[PDB]
From Swiss-Prot:
Activity-pH dependence: Optimum pH is 6-8.
Activity regulation description: Activated by X-ray, histamine, L-adrenaline, L- and D-phenylalanine, L- and D-histidine, L-His-OMe and beta-Ala-His (carnosine).
Effect of V118 to K/R: Strongly reduced CO(2) hydrase and p-nitrophenyl acetate esterase activities
Subcellular location: Cytoplasm; Cell membrane
Cofactor(s) needed by this chain: Zn(2+); Co(2+)
Positions of modified residues (Phosphoserine): S162, S169
Disease: Osteopetrosis, autosomal recessive 3: A rare genetic disease characterized by abnormally dense bone, due to defective resorption of immature bone. Osteopetrosis occurs in two forms: a severe autosomal recessive form occurring in utero, infancy, or childhood, and a benign autosomal dominant form occurring in adolescence or adulthood. Recessive osteopetrosis commonly manifests in early infancy with macrocephaly, feeding difficulties, evolving blindness and deafness, bone marrow failure, severe anemia, and hepatosplenomegaly.
Protein name as it appears in the record: Carbonic anhydrase 2
Binding sites annotated in the UniProt record for Zn(2+): H91, H93, H116
UniProt-annotated site: Fine-tunes the proton-transfer properties of H-64, residues: Y4, N59, N64
Effect listed in the UniProt record for changing V139 to F/Y: Strongly impaired activity
Gene from which this protein is expressed: CA2
Species whose genome carries this gene: Homo sapiens
Length: 257
């Protein structure tokens, strides 16, 4: 029964998921004055040309756009990574107000939202095995600010009415996730965790420096989603973000000067 409310939000999660207090929890604040350039970090390779989106699902905490991950169709490689990571889904975290919503922060700045493109290491054969490994997942995180619309997000926005409530899904084929990327692939990277229960410490985080812009109308449509099921009391799906966690014995590395 975890969520983002007063009685079941992030400060409670540790009672069912004690790793919430672990050594490699996410998100974190990215201090741009202490992250160090690592000249040996390689450019990211984002290979999404053969991506096959399948479906969009409201899971009660966010919505996931799911992909066919049974072949190497949409993969992330390079950067800090060894091997090949397949895209399984993307989802977002967002706020009730434009001044909050991101999970990672940059010099304590919160963005309006944050996109997570979740990929699993093919050496582990399936997602469920990958999450049990320290190098199982690679998550590409992208900040959203409110400004101009993002044309490549509109197809997502327009389906949200069909998945208003928890457990609803809709067909969602032929969506191109390249339309969600900023111009630059400069990034920060560190080892961390899933940001929702089970909070497993299986993620190489790759957080892009450049945000994307979305319009006020686009974010407003995210805020009409519901945490609840159909025929349950309406609770708007907003503020579905975990705050920054202690960095502990980790270093954040930058791909750029
Ligand atoms: Zn996420």
């Amino acid at each position: 029964h975890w969520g983002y409310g007063k009685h079941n939000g992030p400060e409670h999660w540790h009672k069912d998921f004690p790793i919430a207090k672990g050594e490699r929890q996410s998100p974190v604040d990215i201090d741009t004055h202490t992250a160090k350039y690592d000249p040996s970090l390689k450019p990211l390779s984002v290979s999404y040309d053969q991506a096959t989106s399948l479906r969009i699902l409201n899971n009660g905490h966010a919505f996931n756009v799911e992909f066919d991950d049974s072949q190497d169709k949409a993969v992330l490689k390079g950067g800090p990574l060894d091997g090949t990571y397949r895209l399984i889904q993307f989802h977002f975290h967002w706020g009730s107000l434009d001044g909050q919503g991101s999970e990672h922060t940059v010099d304590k700045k919160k963005y309006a939202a944050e996109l997570h493109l979740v990929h699993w290491n093919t050496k582990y054969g399936d997602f469920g095995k990958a999450v049990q490994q320290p190098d199982g997942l690679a998550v590409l995180g992208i900040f959203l600010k409110v400004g101009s619309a993002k044309p490549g997000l509109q197809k997502v926005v327009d389906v949200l009415d069909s998945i208003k409530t928890k457990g609803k899904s809709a067909d969602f084929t032929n969506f191109d996730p390249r339309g969600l990327l900023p111009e630059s692939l400069d990034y920060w990277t560190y080892p961390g965790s899933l940001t929702t229960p089970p909070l497993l410490e299986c993620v190489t985080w790759i957080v892009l420096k450049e945000p994307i812009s979305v319009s006020s109308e686009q974010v407003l449509k995210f805020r009409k989603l519901n945490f609840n099921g159909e025929g349950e009391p309406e609770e708007l799906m907003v503020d579905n973000w975990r705050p920054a966690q202690p960095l502990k014995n980790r270093q954040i590395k930058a791909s750029f000067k």
